[PDB]
Design a protein around this motif. Structure first.
Motif, short mmCIF file in Angstrom:
data_model
loop_
_atom_site.label_atom_id
_atom_site.label_comp_id
_atom_site.label_asym_id
_atom_site.label_seq_id
_atom_site.Cartn_x
_atom_site.Cartn_y
_atom_site.Cartn_z
N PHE A 1 -1.78 5.88 21.25
CA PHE A 1 -1.12 6.68 20.23
C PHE A 1 -1.59 6.25 18.85
O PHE A 1 -1.57 5.05 18.54
CB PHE A 1 0.40 6.53 20.35
CG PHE A 1 0.95 7.10 21.63
CD1 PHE A 1 0.63 8.39 22.03
CD2 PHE A 1 1.75 6.33 22.46
CE1 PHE A 1 1.12 8.91 23.21
CE2 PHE A 1 2.24 6.85 23.65
CZ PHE A 1 1.93 8.14 24.02
N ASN B 1 1.82 6.29 12.83
CA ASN B 1 2.25 7.07 11.67
C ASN B 1 2.89 6.12 10.65
O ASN B 1 2.63 4.92 10.64
CB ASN B 1 3.20 8.17 12.12
CG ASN B 1 4.23 7.64 13.08
OD1 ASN B 1 4.97 6.70 12.77
ND2 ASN B 1 4.26 8.21 14.26
N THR C 1 6.23 5.63 10.49
CA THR C 1 7.28 4.92 11.20
C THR C 1 6.74 3.84 12.12
O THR C 1 7.37 2.80 12.28
CB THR C 1 8.12 5.90 12.03
OG1 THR C 1 7.29 6.46 13.05
CG2 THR C 1 8.69 7.01 11.15
N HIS C 2 5.59 4.09 12.74
CA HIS C 2 5.16 3.30 13.88
C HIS C 2 3.68 2.94 13.79
O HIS C 2 2.88 3.69 13.24
CB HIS C 2 5.44 4.04 15.19
CG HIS C 2 6.88 3.97 15.62
ND1 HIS C 2 7.48 4.95 16.37
CD2 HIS C 2 7.82 3.03 15.39
CE1 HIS C 2 8.74 4.61 16.60
NE2 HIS C 2 8.97 3.45 16.01
C1 LIG Z 1 5.19 7.85 15.29
O1 LIG Z 1 4.54 7.64 16.53
C2 LIG Z 1 5.44 7.24 17.57
C3 LIG Z 1 4.60 6.91 18.77
O2 LIG Z 1 4.43 8.08 19.57
C4 LIG Z 1 6.44 8.36 17.84
O3 LIG Z 1 7.34 7.99 18.88
C5 LIG Z 1 7.20 8.64 16.56
O4 LIG Z 1 8.05 9.77 16.73
C6 LIG Z 1 6.22 8.96 15.44
N1 LIG Z 1 6.93 9.21 14.20
C7 LIG Z 1 6.50 10.11 13.33
C8 LIG Z 1 7.34 10.30 12.13
O5 LIG Z 1 5.47 10.73 13.51
#
Ligand SMILES: *[C@@H]1O[C@H](CO)[C@@H](O)[C@H](O)[C@H]1NC(C)=O
Ligand SMILES: *[C@@H]1O[C@H](CO)[C@@H](O[C@@H]2O[C@H](CO)[C@@H](O)[C@H](O)[C@H]2NC(C)=O)[C@H](O)[C@H]1NC(C)=O
Ligand SMILES: *[C@@H]1O[C@H](CO)[C@@H](O)[C@H](O)[C@H]1NC(C)=O
Ligand SMILES: *[C@@H]1O[C@H](CO)[C@@H](O)[C@H](O)[C@H]1NC(C)=O
Lengths: 104, 124, 124, 107
Positions: free
Chosen positions: A92, A95, A97-98
């Motif tokens: 993945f 972003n 957040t992650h």
């Molecule tokens: C960021 O990536 C994670 C991994 O898949 C996902 O679960 C999460 O919803 C994402 N957040 C955004 C704001 O894109």
């Protein structure tokens, strides 16, 4: 704190100075430009802690810049982990957040 | 004699009692440099902008620096604050003001200065 | 030809340039009664006690009066408080200070006073 | 607004001065100045008065209500207990700080 950096303060005033001291206690940040004291201003995921002021900081909890992330209240934009330069590909991409995940 | 070297912020002009004062060699940007050592009196009011006009949430702070070390550190919640006090000084001392954000001050009606202290050997 | 006074809290005594200054007729209360009209400069620091030595929830407030009319109203979170500013008054005006609680006030290193301002006509 | 009073201020700064001391009557509002020039907002809890220390500007703390009185609201005013015995009735419930005493209806 670190071998090639300077430890100053204890407890919540802990910070790592250089020869730009950075408070290492989570969700604690420099209150002055010289980082004489560490203050407490937590954020949310996908946000850093901007600190405008030239003698005493005020704190705005702005979102994370593109290319970075922050999955905690501490409010620090850590850079994405490029799995490719480390040995893996990315499952993945990641972003605000992650952070990215790596496939062994 | 009498050296009062006031500095209005609006005009950026140092209103002075003498052409070249005995105690100060002022600068245009609002800083100054001490000439004669002795007792002095920093004075002046600092008018901030209204709370409505501020942009950043940076706190209202006004500091006074002698050379590089701190001399005074004042802060209130965006109200009229006076500065200064009696301080004995050596020669060649930099006396200037640093506040966190130069954006949140009222240039109008804001002033600062220093006065030499006539000796006070009488008590009642 | 200078007129400068200063009241200290510890000594409770005014320190003057002259025994009987022409510009004022001071009260040993800490108040002062000006005699000469013209430009004055109220100065002085007000140092409060530590926030652990406090007793009541009353906030730290320092006021300055012209006769019975208020002139200044200051407040901070119980740290050093410089007071005053440049003000022009006339013969026979009551100048003194009112606090929120006199137990806030630390007597050491707390002072105030007024000086008659030598006019500054030059500029820079 | 009051029998031995005249009305002063509007909205939440409303106050009825007597005699010259005033009382902000809007609930949980109290005089901020000795002359009550403005009304401030400092709510408390039952069984608590509002002490106001200060000689130019008041500070506030929710001190409890003195014994012999009560206060069943957040406004922070110690209203007095109803002594029915000296007033005409007997009392069923003696009462505490949080609530007012009750008096017995049948006699
Ligand atoms: C960021 O990536 C994670 C991994 O898949 C996902 O679960 C999460 O919803 C994402 N957040 C955004 C704001 O894109
Ligand atoms: C005294 O405090 C107690 C706190 O529980 C309350 O007691 C009252 O008395 C009855 C007894 O049956 C209690 O069950 C109720 O909680 C209360 N009655 C009512 C009508 O609320 C009450 O707050 C205080 N009592 C008095 C008389 O002031
Ligand atoms: C100066 O002040 C004192 C205060 O006791 C007063 O008695 C005296 O009359 C004053 N002087 C003059 C000239 O009014
Ligand atoms: C009190 O009244 C003012 C109007 O003067 C109003 O703006 C305010 O919302 C009211 N309530 C407060 C201050 O809690």
């Amino acid at each position: 704190c670190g071998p090639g950096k300077v430890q100053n303060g204890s407890g919540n005033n802990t910070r790592c100075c250089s020869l730009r001291c950075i408070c290492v206690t989570p969700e604690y940040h420099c209150g002055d430009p010289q980082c004489k004291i560490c203050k407490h201003y937590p954020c949310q995921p996908g946000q850093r802690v901007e600190s405008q002021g030239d003698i005493v900081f005020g704190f705005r909890c702005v979102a994370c810049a593109m290319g970075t992330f922050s999955a905690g209240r501490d409010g620090h934009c850590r850079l994405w982990t490029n799995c490719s330069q480390f040995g893996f590909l990315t499952m993945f991409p990641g972003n605000k957040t992650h952070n990215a995940v790596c496939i062994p | 004699e009498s050296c009062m070297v006031k500095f209005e912020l609006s005009s950026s002009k140092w209103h002075m009692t003498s052409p070249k004062p005995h105690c100060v060699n002022t600068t245009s940007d609002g800083k100054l440099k001490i000439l004669q050592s002795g007792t002095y009196l920093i004075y002046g009011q600092v008018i901030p902008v209204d709370k409505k006009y501020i942009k950043d949430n940076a706190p209202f702070v006004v500091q006074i620096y002698k050379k590089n070390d701190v001399l005074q550190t004042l802060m209130n919640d965006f109200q009229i604050l006076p500065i200064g006090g009696v301080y004995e000084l050596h020669a060649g001392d930099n006396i200037y003001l640093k506040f966190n954000s130069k954006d949140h001050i009222q240039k109008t009606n804001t002033y600062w200065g220093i006065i030499l202290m006539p000796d006070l050997p009488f008590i009642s």
